[PDB]
Write a protein that binds this ligand. Structure first.
Ligand code: BGC
Ligand code: BGC
Lengths: 175, 165
């Protein structure tokens, strides 16, 4: 099971994009490649050889899970991915992944810090978790579209509020 | 507020470290590649006014949904000689987030719901510009498919260097 951290620099995006802000998720605001990083484990043999924003090697049919997060681990600003699909606007590309799905599950025993000065020992408690998941169909290079909501912390309400739905067009390679 | 993601490749660590596993948090296992910070040889370097707040958020590559990590110590590392006093002491900072967003139960998760949740970060404030050697200790919890729960595998220690300029 290959996990991919999808990190977003919300502060940068809020600084740069002052127009074209969208709260219609079918018409998200396009953003450049400077504020997002996708990270996976070394055991999945990542490769900085190539032009792809992410590259790794795992057997066909392995499960892949994408976890979106702001730089505050969704504790201050936050992001939630709502779409991951093949991008056809850049010409033919490979069918590397099966359709992604929003996958919500119960984690019966998730650990959190306890109320001690250093947080130890951890307590375990149930919690819902979510990831966008798929499976590797075949080796190849696939252009993608990734859309997510960008939620900014509002100090007034102490709540995270939608600022804009956004879209990034990475390329991913399974070799 | 400067936020720093502290990411840990729990799968790599579990593959590479086969001895020296410790469940004594006062004698954690040292690690070299598998930890990164995202915001000289400084593992992290950034520039913000003195007295700004800094918040460190620890996470596995599954956002603590499969394996998980929890930082329990961030302190000045004195085993490599004198180093600068760049940060004030860190504290474990737990707060209530009245309105955290989560996906709703729709097919694509939209629109998001809001719900209360406890968050935590290790926080501090910049005392001065400089380069400080640090020690960072954390618990590494692995997902046990048998119980569907995350269980302590080892307490671990990484020794980064951070520069505020
Ligand atoms: O308007 C409020 C927002 O300001 C931005 O500069 C920050 O990146 C956000 O975290 C904050 O919630
Ligand atoms: O299989 C034992 C452990 O292997 C590691 O590679 C995984 O990251 C853990 O989730 C798992 O519990």
């Amino acid at each position: 099971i290959v996990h991919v951290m999808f990190l977003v620099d919300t502060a940068y995006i809020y600084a740069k994009y002052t127009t074209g802000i969208s709260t219609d998720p079918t018409k998200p605001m396009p953003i450049d490649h400077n504020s997002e990083v996708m990270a996976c484990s070394f055991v999945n043999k990542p490769s900085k050889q190539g032009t792809a924003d992410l590259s790794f090697s795992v057997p066909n049919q392995s499960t892949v899970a994408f976890w979106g997060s702001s730089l505050s681990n969704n504790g201050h600003d936050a992001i939630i991915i709502y779409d991951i699909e093949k991008n056809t606007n850049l010409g033919p590309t490979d069918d590397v992944f099966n359709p992604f799905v929003m996958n919500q599950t119960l984690l019966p025993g998730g650990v959190i810090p306890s109320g001690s000065i250093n947080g130890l020992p951890a307590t375990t408690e149930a919690r819902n978790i979510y990831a966008l998941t798929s499976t590797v169909k075949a080796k190849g290079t696939e252009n993608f579209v990734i859309r997510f909501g960008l939620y900014l912390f509002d100090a007034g309400t102490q709540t995270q509020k939608l600022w804009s739905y956004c879209q990034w067009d990475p390329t991913i390679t399974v070799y």
